[PDB]
Amino acid sequence: GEDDEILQRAKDILKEDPNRKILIILNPDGKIELYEVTSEEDIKRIAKKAGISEELLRRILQSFRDGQYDLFFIAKTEDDERRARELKERMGKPVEILRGSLEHHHHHH
Question: Where the chain is broken, by preceding residue (C–N > 2.5 Å)?
Fold first, then answer.
């Protein structure tokens, strides 16, 4: 399936170019997208291509500046993170899980 081939290609990009970076987009339908990226200026293309929130986008740019992981997952909601956390187990390579949205928590009676 679509999420099997890209999971290998993320490692293949890094095997040939370890100086380059990988972005992964969570879709709410359970689909996935793979993107190639080199610098924060390149991530600005992904922001408008994938439709990432600007509060999330700064976390992607910061994750490149830290540079500690082999690929990056955009868990825009915890409903998307449900796939991101479970993929990290089967993938064996380490993944950083990026969170951020405009919704605020409350309790009422």
Answer: none
Using CA atoms, how far apart are residues 36 and 14, in angstroms rounded to an integer?
10
Residue 41 identity? E
8 Å CB contact between 98 and 75 = yes
Calpha distance 40→64 (Å, rounded): 7
The strand pair at 21-26 and 71-74 is best described as parallel
- Among candidates 32, 6, 37, which has minimal Cα distance to 22? 37
Where are the domains positioned within the chain? 2-98
DSSP 106: -
CA–CA distance, 51 with 72 (Å, rounded to integer): 16
Q: Which helix (H) or strand (E) holds 35?
A: strand 32-37
Burial class (CB in 10 A: 0-12, 13-18, 19+), 76: buried
Experimental method: NMR
Burial status of residue 42 (CB atoms within 10 A of its CB: 0-12, 13-18, 19 or more): middle
